[PDB]
Amino acid sequence: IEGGWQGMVDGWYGYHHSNEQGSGYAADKESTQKAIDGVTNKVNSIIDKMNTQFEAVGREFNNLERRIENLNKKMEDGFLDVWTYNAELLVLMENERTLDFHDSNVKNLYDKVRLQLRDNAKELGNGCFEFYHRCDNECMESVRN
Amino acid sequence: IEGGWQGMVDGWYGYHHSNEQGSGYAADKESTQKAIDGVTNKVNSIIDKMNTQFEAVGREFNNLERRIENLNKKMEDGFLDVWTYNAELLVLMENERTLDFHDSNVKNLYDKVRLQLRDNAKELGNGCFEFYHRCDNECMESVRNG
Amino acid sequence: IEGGWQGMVDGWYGYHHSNEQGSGYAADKESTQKAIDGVTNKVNSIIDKMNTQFEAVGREFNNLERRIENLNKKMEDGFLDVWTYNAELLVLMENERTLDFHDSNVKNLYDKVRLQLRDNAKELGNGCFEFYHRCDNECMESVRN
Amino acid sequence: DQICIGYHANNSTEQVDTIMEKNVTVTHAQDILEKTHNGKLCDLDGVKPLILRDCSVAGWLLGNPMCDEFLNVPEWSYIVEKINPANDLCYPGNFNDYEELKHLLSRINHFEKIQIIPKSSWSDHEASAGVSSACPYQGRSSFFRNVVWLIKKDNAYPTIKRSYNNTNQEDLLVLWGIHHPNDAAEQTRLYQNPTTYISVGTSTLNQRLVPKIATRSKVNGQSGRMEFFWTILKPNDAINFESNGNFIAPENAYKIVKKGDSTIMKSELEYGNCNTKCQTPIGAINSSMPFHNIHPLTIGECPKYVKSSRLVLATGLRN
Amino acid sequence: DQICIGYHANNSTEQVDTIMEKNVTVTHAQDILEKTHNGKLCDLDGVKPLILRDCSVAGWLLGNPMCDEFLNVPEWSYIVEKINPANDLCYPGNFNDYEELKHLLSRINHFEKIQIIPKSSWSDHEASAGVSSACPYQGRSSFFRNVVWLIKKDNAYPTIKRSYNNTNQEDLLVLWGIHHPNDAAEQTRLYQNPTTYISVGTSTLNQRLVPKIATRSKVNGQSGRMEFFWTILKPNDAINFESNGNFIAPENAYKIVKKGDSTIMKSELEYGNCNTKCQTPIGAINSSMPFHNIHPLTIGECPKYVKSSRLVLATGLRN
Amino acid sequence: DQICIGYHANNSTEQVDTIMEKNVTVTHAQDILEKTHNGKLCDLDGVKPLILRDCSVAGWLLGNPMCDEFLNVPEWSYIVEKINPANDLCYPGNFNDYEELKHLLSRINHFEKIQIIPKSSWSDHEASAGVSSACPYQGRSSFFRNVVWLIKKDNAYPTIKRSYNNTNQEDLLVLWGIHHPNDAAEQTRLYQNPTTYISVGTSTLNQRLVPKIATRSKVNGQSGRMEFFWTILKPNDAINFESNGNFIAPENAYKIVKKGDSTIMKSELEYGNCNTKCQTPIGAINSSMPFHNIHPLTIGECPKYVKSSRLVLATGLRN
């Protein structure tokens, strides 16, 4: 699979069913509905997990308290660096699994149409399969159920 | 494969072999023995990895040391929040891979009985396969070895 | 697949094509070139991500400043332990995905030679496949293109 | 007849990062980092801050004549002070444990200033000549409003013995000081007595101060110095002053009427006639983002601060 | 004939969480967080703590008459003090560098108290009239046991010159004080000399104290104040006191006999007649769990503290 | 005919760790942790450190006679001091706010020492007898070089009034002290006047010191003590001293000529005649590794410090 389809507007994952006369796309609502839930749960988890995080406070020190002034500065910068790292890393982790989540679902949908029809159909590649009979728009939608 | 089987008491992963007359379950000792090792190693890794962790100490300050008292409090709370986060996150990560580890092994056991018998058998689905001959209790156990 | 092949010296992933007379190995440059890029990017990411990290500084305290001396020590040790943990954990994470990356590519190369030739060939196992005709050194290299 | 499976693509150029990859182009992405602020100091949830303008906390509390705007301020949400306020100690010197006082002030939302010793109550001392050109007001020599620089009267400075009992329910912030003169002649000229002290007692305070004569550089035109002190006088406790000279006596003190979350913010900005839930020293934030990178020192209901320049989550597929 | 492949299931309702999922039911799970304690203060690995009851560290060390239970305590594992002990400085005042002393005390397991200056050795001063109603004992005026409040004798207070050489092998904790009187008449009434001092020297100490007269509120019935001081006298070093009044002299001092890991725990609990490997201020822990959430301030061989309410690992499959 | 697919293997025994696995043998691995150093103190990017040898910072700055090697040092990259330098305060006593001075020093790369009060300028005091056997030099009693111990002359110690105006462009570090004698007889023997003071003033300093007589143990053969003080005198400001005794006067002071990144390193090592980009107190590092575990306190362009004993990345496949 080289590139994506610009034509597909409805959903994220879908079937491009092309009958003897007609030709058009169709989004898989069974997968796309479950996908919108998966993304909205992971984003809210990142929001809730980072609520306990360091809060810097202004402290003042005189000219002969330079050591503790420096200690204070180092300490507050220290925690801000730690939580910056945690936030950035968690985003990279969530991004990795989000893209793998998409590739997982696309390839699961490939195997769904392939595996369901063992002796009747054989997968040529890129999603598409073979048959011993022609397939009208009525037949095209039959693979879903 | 929808759900699990309560009838299987012996092990975690196993075959439900059902002959012409009899019918019963059987645990896969080759996989189940390797699985108990995999779980016990990951739990001990979490125990050993978190041994270097912040230890709060009691410090006392007088009425004109409120700034450093507050500094001290913020610092100790700061580290406790950091390590709480680390502990909780590591548990979520270990849990994710543990459940994926189980699904991996169940589906590997599906492919084992399928792949081994290419031209002889064909997988119908949910583990179960096809044959051009009947299969007694003797035949049922033959799929493990050969 | 029990072990690897010492005879393969050129690349990481490759085909062991053995004709009617001859017998030798050959590295997959399409995969091996992409693999060297994947490893060099992940190692540099670990270098760049950890650049903001705690830097301990020497501070001195007198005999009646023992409480803040202890506070300072605990604070600096605290951050060093945090970043030691972060560094070690990130290495374990990168190692896990590196080994899975290798297993992924080896099994993808298994399916490439299998899937490409559906009705013509059938995979026996361990990479190797079947045919209805003999296969010379010329035929052996034909599976790549 | 041919059905096939595939995924969505577009002409976007928004990019995200991964653990193993960087600058990956995606069809959809969700920014979660707030980078904008309004550039103004605002009310915090309806409550206006105390903006000190060119005055310091010391200038405000002691009553530097240039700081008369702040003689009786209403309840505040936070305090704003410039990095280097011009109106501080007009008469040069210092404020003892100043930083600890500021720390306490960061937990206070409102004072009620009250008169505890009337200027008119000094019968045997001169109470209306305690002024300096270091503390100008409308083109003439003046002084801090909340304390009184007493000097001798009819060539005499009798020993002062004066007490104030805190009969209020509130803790009371009390301020006083000592004058450090330039030389022995100045000492006798102002106070008559050559060797002086100030003693101060409460249930916890046990202070005895002696003036330090030293030859010092002119600051704001003056070589003399004033050193100021403070205490929290608890309800039902009393403060007792004794002195035979150099005493800068309390006139007004501050009842602590409301405590809560506050802060002293350092900022050069002025009041922006706005309301916010989240203030930083360089501007207010109004965002539903979980993170921001505006400034680490915030007050109110804010997103979490990070040093990141960019933080973008992947939502759609590769492009 | 039909063989099929499957996995184990049961009727458990134990649940675990994942990064992408929450409240997932599993056949097996491993709790790794200790949430229980015994609610008692125990011996630590066979060694009993020093429980100060209603006494503070100052009350114990100076010998507040209400704290006689602690005149000669045995070796301890840790020290327990209440948040606000009633028996502290009976005669009002303060303990100089108190918090730094407590810090040292947190590294000590045992003192041996010794007499370094007998009360009977004061021939030219009154050593048996140094009492106050602020320090009651069995219905009468008394005083701290380990120091002595000297006053004049036969209307005279000769200059004291007294030295003590630490001929022991141990470091010695030495305590003394100064009395700050109410007025000049009280000064001459107790000590005869109107202008007094205390000088103290060792190889590192160079102290000269002068009493501060001030008019102060009554605390425990008294307006006078005592200010206490301490030093660590090294083996073979000597401490030299000189004074013509206001001196609260050492009688007893503490040899430091054992150092080690200790702590001062703040707790309202009493002794629980138990033994443990791990103590917190609200109870002891006996667990093999790697984590706990009881209290952050522990001593002994403990699990690691986290703020979590729950921490459960998945071991078995989904249910 | 048989083509088959497989992966590379070798006879290596290098091992790596994973989250779920440990000691996994691999064909290739990349070490990313530096464990070696050269065991020497080196120049930092061409600039030599100030190695104090057996002298402390106090010994250097005050001019302990044993520290003459450091009377006028060149620009340094960092400072090295031993844990317990033998040459510190030869005459016993203390250095006020010593640690804060060291902190300032950690931001300075070069001083230029100048004479501000000539020893020959004391006409009515003895300026050449201020010596002690506690400060030996070439077999005779001597003293700190940069300050002067004045005593009486012809049985008199007139009141000193001396000012120095900082007419330089640089901030000036100025040092002075007070002598605390052994007894009243020693006081009159050295200074004639029984009751003395030192007053010091600048635009910010307002100091009045009084000597403390106390009976003290001998340190370096002496029971007397010297207490030293310092200030930063700004360009165009002046410092004014007044005293009738016990004054240890400035002679030389330090112009601050260059500020920058520095540090005071504690180390027992000597100069190693080398150059480096990265120094630790136990040795220099020359590495392209991203991490090291040598020592947490480094200066220069260094890898990141971790406590790990081993840190190895997987590059190749399983073996």
Ligand SMILES: CC(=O)N[C@@H]1[C@@H](O)[C@H](O[C@@H]2O[C@H](CO)[C@H](O)[C@H](O[C@]3(C(=O)O)C[C@H](O)[C@@H](NC(C)=O)[C@H]([C@H](O)[C@H](O)CO)O3)[C@H]2O)[C@@H](CO)O[C@H]1O
């Ligand atoms: C070159 C020369 O000799 N000029 C003097 C000139 O200095 C002097 O002015 C007076 O100098 C004195 C110090 O000696 C004070 O600085 C006077 O200033 C004031 C002030 O404004 O602060 C005046 C004020 O009336 C005084 N207030 C009170 C309550 O005493 C204060 C106060 O004494 C000091 O601040 C205490 O430290 O000082 C300043 O006018 C003139 C006038 O005498 O004579 C020249 O010869």
Ligand SMILES: CC(=O)N[C@@H]1[C@@H](O)[C@H](O[C@@H]2O[C@H](CO)[C@H](O)[C@H](O[C@]3(C(=O)O)C[C@H](O)[C@@H](NC(C)=O)[C@H]([C@H](O)[C@H](O)CO)O3)[C@H]2O)[C@@H](CO)O[C@H]1O
């Ligand atoms: C209303 C009125 O005038 N009442 C007085 C009443 O104050 C006075 O009681 C005595 O007052 C003095 C203060 O001037 C002390 O407070 C006395 O208390 C003691 C004490 O218990 O602490 C008595 C004790 O014997 C003294 N001990 C020594 C060693 O001197 C101490 C000591 O002087 C002070 O603590 C030092 O500051 O004080 C208190 O009894 C009564 C009786 O004289 O007369 C009323 O008229």
Ligand SMILES: CC(=O)N[C@@H]1[C@@H](O)[C@H](O[C@@H]2O[C@H](CO)[C@H](O)[C@H](O[C@]3(C(=O)O)C[C@H](O)[C@@H](NC(C)=O)[C@H]([C@H](O)[C@H](O)CO)O3)[C@H]2O)[C@@H](CO)O[C@H]1O
């Ligand atoms: C057993 C006995 O009594 N022996 C004394 C012996 O102590 C004494 O030695 C002198 O003792 C005095 C103390 O009283 C000083 O310690 C003398 O030391 C010096 C010093 O080297 O520091 C000598 C020096 O010349 C003095 N310098 C100045 C500027 O005055 C200093 C200085 O006075 C003190 O350091 C100030 O604290 O003291 C020490 O020689 C001998 C000689 O008198 O006589 C025995 O009887």
Ligand SMILES: *[C@@H]1O[C@H](CO)[C@@H](O)[C@H](O)[C@H]1NC(C)=O
């Ligand atoms: C203050 O006044 C009240 C009421 O007159 C009195 O009870 C109290 O003792 C006084 N406090 C002091 C410290 O004198």
Ligand SMILES: *[C@@H]1O[C@H](CO)[C@@H](O)[C@H](O)[C@H]1NC(C)=O
């Ligand atoms: C105390 O006594 C010992 C033993 O004689 C002696 O050596 C030491 O110098 C004395 N210490 C002091 C400070 O006098």
Ligand SMILES: *[C@@H]1O[C@H](CO)[C@@H](O)[C@H](O)[C@H]1NC(C)=O
């Ligand atoms: C120092 O000298 C300059 C120039 O002579 C003078 O203007 C300045 O006022 C002096 N500083 C002080 C504090 O006297």
